[PDB]
Design a protein around this ligand. Structure first.
Ligand code: ZWY
Ligand code: ZWY
Length: 1364
């Protein structure tokens, strides 16, 4: 005791000197000593010294067994000469990061640590040898390893360091504020706060993110991996990615394993301190401060167990990001230059899957990776204390929980083989959705739509019944985190009681053990996640091996240093092949091109043209020969390559933008016509990111880029293949030809054209990969050989009401039945724990233990309920969630079918497919589990808080300020991290957009020697994602610190209010209070983890419910207002001053229509170009609502008739008739309303009987999407049959001569003539052949009636009808 005190001298010295040292460390402006190997090891002695200042402590705690609870001096000295070492190894780090080299204060610290250890050193030696032997070897070795460590640390701190050499001024913008951050301010992540403020008063945009720090800018971490991967090769004086990946990410992973080790060896302090508190709180002779001290250093040892952890995550997420960046960078570097053969063999859509998956799950593996050893050290240690505590019974408990690793992975393999192996129902349903969406027109003019509604409802209900048992087996992840704690504690206590009835249960056993099971159970449920992620990353690593071990394409295929005089391109009898094994396509080909000479290449289709130019660039492995060039080149691939950026970039292509040259190239290529058409000018987006440019324009822009690149040797490749002929002549005239700009440029042209030949200079004739004839066309025309044969708030948190909406979609008899039922379960759980307390403090007084068999019993029947009242809840939540989907999905679908055609016109059919794809997916199987786990976490927190309050009644005083602080931190997080999540989720996809673009364009990326220039772009596009995935990680950490002080300032108060009322209560209550206050910082991150996994997901319900009540304005059927049955046979059409327009506030297309055709008569409509005759058709079916004027049919107004009855009676043949995938029975009669014989009879008349009879499926002939397996004409025949079945008195035609051939036009006109003599006929067409024969014809012009009479009367009037 005269020396245990003496060891306190250096600790108190360093502690008191610390606040008078950080005010001088900041008096050094900036030194930034480089990380030498001395300072890298001056802080490894200290951490190891803490780890031997641990056994110097837990030896003291071993007195708990054998009875002797240690005196405070006997267990605080190792606990505080252990904390300072985590501060010695931290002033070592923070000093080096400042200018100081000779530490001064810290060398004194180590010196005193040595000096105060001299006296026991000068004493323990003499007492040992003289009196015998070991004499308590544990305190001996823990001392003499401490002495060696401190001596070595002093010696190493006696050395000098390098001069600061620091820097000049770095850069102006907001720099990453971890550099230039004081000691106390970087320990607690206080520097991030500036954004936590700015992330709440304003929104965040890319201009205001942390300008990323220099070490990891994705071009300094790729290099750190390329160097390792290169140096890790065969090395004779085979290679594996894993070795390089370790050698380049081992420095940042054995410095993030020290933190995990420190944390999980610092975590086993609190259960033992709790044991000390419980077993002093019973003692009435122990002075008061022996409990106050334990509470104090149960706080100051739990605001440090979770500060070397929330500071762990900062160092193993910012290495997950470095995995995700090094992998992507090296893969991109490879994919630029491998081979065209390897691309052809593999899939261009698969290479990109080497990011966003299959190489990003390395970012998802980093946090789980250290679990590999931290699980077998959180167990073989937490088993030890438990065994020490309850005895062998503990095994059973842990055994059960270990047993819960497979049966929590068995569902993870039943599910994931029950929701993706059978989600093809979703695939087929979304296919049917896409089919229904486009072509909705003909689907809606006739009443086919509700049959499709029935079809999709049936497939949906099939997809949901397979989703019932796809979520019940998810209520086994609400059985691990809400019902397993009680089960494991019960089984432990059960085996403990049954094995031998002589062992009582007291507070310091039961409650320490149930507070230690907590510590063991977090890294024993994320362990199955480890198995899953590691076993699906062990294949990703193999795949990245497969990609990186692919042959490059530079065996110096071309040399660009020497050339024959006056020549630009020459090849010496070379041979080329598209694959290293396949027969060479080219055999000993020889061409000598003079400078500036245009050369054309000829042949038939399949002689080897396109494989000539591809060989010149160096993408065709030459078996023999030497290919030469001199100067830059420009390549125009046949499948022209369009960059996924703006037109200015996609034409300038990394050059200097000169408006004079730029504009003249654009006009010479004849692309200004598109520019005047372009909606935004020459800045329009291109590619999948922009307007999908058709084939014609892509070659124009490619050729323009080539010519503006003004390289020496243009290697063209039939760019005029997919363009209009006349402009193509100008394209050759103004650009390629000698009159054009490129007279002095060595052009090489390969094309199938003929007319361009005479204007060329030289021509090369290709046959089976061999040259036959060379020379000018007028000279070659003398030969006339086989070549002659070639000739012929808007932004913010969601409103509260939407939550209610979701409840109204679950039934609202289930919402009460689930909220009330969790309230019941929480009451049961608190009852179980209170009963355990009243058992454990009962066992100490009662002389009779015979009563135990009751308490145990009821404990079971009071916690088993808490299982049976949670599972029976979680199912009735999942079995509500799918219900919540069902109705909700219906309420969307049944409205989108009922929307006006203008809704589908103003929309590109992409947004209305976003829903039914994702926004219906989130409410389908992403929202129900999240809300279930939120509702588990909230009630876990409630049960914990109420048990703490109940056990120590006066603790309620502080429960408000903790609540306000925690809510403040939660709100600040939910602002700033929401901003960052949005800003990062939208900036990552440009990486994969820039990829999937170099892969296709690797041919044209090279030959512009732009490969290096084109990977810096990938570096900056992943940099613009790193600079918003870093501050999100740090924001998460700053939150978790804020929610951790308010989860440790409650352990402090639980212990303190336990010790302040010692005279009142009995030990069974403080044990419960403290042991359930130790996990009020786990059920307080879980309740935020979910409350932000539901704020970013219940946006989906708002959107889905918003897509409703969208002005359907179309009642399918009416109440009793149906027109009289047998309605068509009257068949009279009559108008009264009709006028209509597409949209409100739109120029009238129809005006004052007053037309009438009698019953059974035939009539057509003709309109001049621009009259707007098409709309008339839709006006008959009430597609456009009658603006002014009632279209009366048979003396009845159609505006008061149900469409499903109104449209059924009429008969339409649409302008663009379409088939729908499925049988023919569906494609002619979904309602099954007609006899098959007449169907076949109509099919016979449809000129299709030979086709249907030739197929045994016939009526069941499975049509492709739109009947693509049939020809166009056959599709109009099928739709002609479609109209044939209905056979009503009213017939109307839509564009009988729109674009069909004259052959089928004759057939359709004849079919119209033969059967439809009696029935009323209306007609619209581009050709008067079917109209001139009508009894009466109306002529529509600019939306008014002009000529409504017989064609003979029209002939006399000589209008537009008779004009031509
Ligand atoms: C902590 C993290 C990592 C990242 C997420 O945590 S979050 O607070 O940053 O969202 C999810 C997750 C939960 C449990 C964590 C885990 C990574 C590995 C951990 C730290 C262990 O060995 C014990 C606890 C495990
Ligand atoms: C909450 C979550 C993640 C979601 C899981 O539920 S699931 O339905 O998503 O599988 C439960 C799960 C396990 C451990 C949880 C973790 C989220 C973050 C937590 C709370 C910490 O910082 C410590 C423990 C971590």
């Amino acid at each position: 005791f005269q020396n245990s005190l003496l060891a306190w001298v250096p600790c108190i010295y360093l502690w008191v000197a610390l606040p008078c040292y950080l005010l001088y460390l900041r008096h050094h402006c900036r030194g930034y000593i480089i990380l030498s190997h001395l300072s890298k090891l001056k802080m490894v002695l200290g951490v190891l010294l803490w780890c031997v200042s641990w056994a110097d402590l837990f030896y003291s705690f071993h007195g708990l067994v054998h009875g002797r609870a240690p005196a405070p001096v006997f267990f605080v000295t190792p606990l505080v000469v252990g904390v300072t070492m985590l501060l010695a190894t931290l002033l070592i780090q923070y000093e080096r990061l400042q200018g100081v080299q000779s530490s001064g204060v810290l060398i004194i610290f180590w010196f005193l640590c040595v000096v105060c250890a001299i006296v026991p050193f000068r004493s323990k030696i003499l007492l040992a040898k003289a009196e015998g032997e070991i004499s308590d070897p544990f305190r001996f070795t823990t001392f003499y390893i401490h002495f060696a460590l401190v001596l070595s640390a002093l010696i190493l701190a006696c050395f000098r360091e390098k001069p600061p050499f620091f820097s000049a001024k770095n850069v102006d913008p907001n720099p990453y504020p971890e550099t230039s951050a004081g000691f106390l301010s970087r320990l607690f992540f206080w520097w991030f706060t500036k954004m936590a403020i700015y992330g709440y008063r304003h929104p965040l945009e890319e201009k205001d993110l942390w300008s990323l720090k220099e070490e990891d800018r994705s071009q300094m971490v790729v290099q750190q991996l390329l160097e390792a991967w290169r140096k890790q090769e065969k090395q004779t004086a085979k290679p594996s990615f894993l070795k390089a990946l370790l050698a380049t990410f081992g420095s940042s992973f054995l410095i993030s394993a020290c933190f995990k080790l420190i944390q999980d060896l610092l975590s086993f302090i609190n259960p033992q301190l709790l044991s000390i508190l419980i077993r002093f709180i019973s003692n009435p002779m122990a002075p008061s401060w022996w409990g106050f001290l334990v509470a104090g250093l149960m706080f100051l040892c739990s605001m440090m167990q979770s500060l070397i952890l929330q500071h762990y995550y900062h160092y193993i997420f910012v290495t997950g990001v470095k995995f995700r960046t090094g992998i992507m960078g090296v893969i991109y570097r490879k994919a630029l230059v491998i081979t065209n053969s390897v691309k052809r063999a593999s899939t261009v859509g698969e290479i990109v899957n080497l990011m966003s998956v299959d190489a990003q799950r390395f970012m998802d593996l980093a946090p789980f990776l250290n679990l590999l050893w931290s699980a077998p050290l959180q167990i073989i240690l937490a088993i030890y204390f438990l065994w020490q505590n309850l005895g062998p019974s503990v095994l059973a408990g842990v055994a059960f929980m270990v047993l819960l690793i497979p049966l929590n992975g068995a569902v993870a393999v039943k599910m994931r083989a029950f929701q993706v192996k059978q989600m093809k129902l979703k695939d087929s349903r979304i296919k049917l959705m896409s089919e229904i969406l486009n072509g909705i027109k003909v689907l809606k003019l006739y009443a086919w739509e509700p049959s499709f509604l029935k079809q999709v409802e049936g497939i949906r209900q099939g997809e949901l019944q397979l989703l019932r048992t796809a979520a019940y087996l998810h209520t086994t992840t609400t059985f691990t985190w809400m019902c397993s704690p009680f089960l494991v504690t019960l089984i432990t206590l059960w085996v403990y009681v049954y094995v031998d009835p002589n062992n009582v249960l007291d507070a310091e056993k039961a409650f320490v053990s149930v507070s230690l099971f907590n510590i063991l159970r977090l890294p024993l449920n994320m362990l199955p996640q480890l198995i899953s992620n590691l076993t699906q990353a062990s294949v990703s690593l193999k795949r990245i091996q497969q990609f990186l071990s692919q042959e490059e394409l530079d065996p110096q295929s071309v040399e660009r240093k020497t050339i024959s005089p006056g020549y630009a391109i020459t090849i010496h009898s070379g041979t080329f092949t598209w694959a290293q094994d396949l027969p060479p396509t080219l055999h000993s080909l020889d061409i000598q091109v003079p400078k500036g000479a245009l050369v054309a290449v000829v042949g038939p289709v399949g002689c080897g043209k396109s494989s000539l130019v591809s060989a010149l660039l160096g993408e065709m492995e030459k078996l023999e020969g030497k290919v030469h060039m001199k100067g830059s080149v420009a390549y125009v691939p046949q499948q022209a390559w369009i960059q996924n950026c703006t037109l200015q970039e996609n034409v300038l292509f990394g050059k200097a933008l000169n408006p004079k040259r730029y504009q003249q190239t654009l006009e010479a290529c004849a692309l200004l016509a598109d520019l005047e058409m372009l909606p935004g000018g020459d800045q329009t987006e291109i590619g999948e990111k922009g307007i999908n440019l058709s084939g014609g324009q892509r070659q124009r822009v490619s050729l323009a880029r080539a010519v503006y690149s003004d390289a020496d040797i243009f290697l063209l490749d039939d760019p005029l293949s997919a363009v209009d002929s006349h402009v193509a002549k100008h394209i050759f005239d103004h650009v390629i030809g000698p009159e054009g700009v490129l007279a002095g440029k060595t052009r090489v042209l390969v094309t199938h054209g003929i007319s361009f030949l005479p204007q060329t200079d030289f021509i090369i004739v290709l046959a089976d990969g061999q040259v036959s004839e060379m020379g000018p066309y007028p000279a070659l025309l003398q030969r006339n050989g086989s070549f002659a044969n070639f000739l012929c708030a808007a932004i913010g948190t969601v409103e509260l009401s939407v939550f209610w909406d979701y409840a109204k979609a679950v039934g609202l008899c289930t919402t009460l039945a689930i909220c009330l039922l969790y309230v019941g379960q929480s009451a049961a759980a608190i009852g179980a724990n209170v009963w355990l307390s009243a058992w454990t403090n009962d066992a100490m007084a009662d002389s009779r233990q015979n009563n135990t068999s009751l308490r145990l019993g009821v404990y079971a029947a009071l916690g088993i309920l808490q299982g049976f009242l949670v599972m029976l809840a979680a199912m009735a939540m999942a079995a509500g969630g799918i219900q919540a989907a069902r109705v909700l999905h219906q309420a969307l679908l049944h409205n989108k079918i009922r929307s006006p055609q203008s809704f589908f016109d103003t929309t590109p059919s992409g947004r209305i497919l976003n829903c039914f794809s994702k926004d219906i997916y989130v409410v389908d199987e992403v929202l129900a589990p999240v809300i279930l786990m939120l509702l588990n976490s909230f009630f876990n927190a409630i049960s914990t808080l109420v048990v703490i309050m109940a056990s120590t009644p006066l603790f309620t005083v502080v429960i408000l300020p903790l609540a306000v602080l925690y809510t403040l931190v939660q709100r600040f997080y939910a602002a700033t991290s929401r901003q960052l999540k949005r800003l990062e989720s939208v900036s990552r996809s440009p990486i994969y957009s820039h990829f999937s673009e170099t892969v296709t364009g690797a041919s044209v990326i090279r030959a512009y020697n732009r490969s290096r220039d084109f990977e810096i772009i990938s570096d900056t596009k992943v940099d613009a994602n790193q600079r918003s995935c870093y501050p999100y990680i740090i924001s998460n950490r700053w939150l978790s610190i804020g929610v951790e002080f308010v989860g440790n300032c409650v352990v402090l108060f639980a212990a303190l209010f336990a010790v302040i009322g010692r005279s009142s209560l009995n030990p069974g209550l403080v044990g419960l209070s403290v042991s359930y206050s130790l996990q009020v910082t786990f059920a307080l991150n879980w309740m935020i983890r979910m409350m932000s996994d539901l704020e970013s997901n219940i946006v989906a319900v708002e959107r889905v419910k918003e897509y409703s009540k969208t002005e359907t304005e179309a009642p399918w059927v009416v109440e009793g207002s149906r027109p009289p049955e047998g309605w068509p046979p009257r068949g009279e059409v009559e108008f009264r001053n009709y006028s209509v327009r597409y949209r409100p506030g739109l120029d009238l297309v129809l005006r004052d229509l007053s037309l009438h055709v009698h019953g059974g008569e035939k009539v057509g409509i003709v309109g001049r170009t621009g009259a707007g005759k098409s709309s008339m058709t839709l006006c008959l079916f009430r597609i456009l609502e009658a603006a002014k004027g009632e279209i009366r049919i048979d003396g009845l107004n159609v505006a008061d008739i149900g469409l499903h009855d109104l449209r059924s009676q009429l008969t339409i043949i649409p302008q663009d008739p379409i088939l729908f995938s499925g049988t023919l029975r569906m494609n002619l009669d979904p309602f099954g309303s007609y006899s098959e014989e007449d169907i076949w009879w109509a099919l016979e008349l449809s000129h299709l009987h030979t086709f249907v009879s030739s197929q045994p499926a016939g009526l069941d002939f499975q049509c492709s999407e739109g009947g693509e397996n049939l020809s166009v004409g056959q599709r109009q025949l099928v739709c002609l049959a479609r109209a044939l079945l209905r056979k009503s008195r009213i017939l109307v035609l839509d564009e009988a001569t729109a674009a069909i051939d004259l052959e089928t036009d004759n057939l359709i006109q004849a079919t119209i003539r033969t059967q439809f003599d009696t029935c009323t006929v209306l007609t619209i067409a581009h050709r008067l052949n079917t109209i001139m024969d009508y009894t009466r014809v109306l002529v529509l012009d600019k939306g008014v009636v002009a000529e409504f009479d017989s064609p003979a009367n029209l002939i006399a009037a000589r209008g537009i009808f008779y004009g031509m």
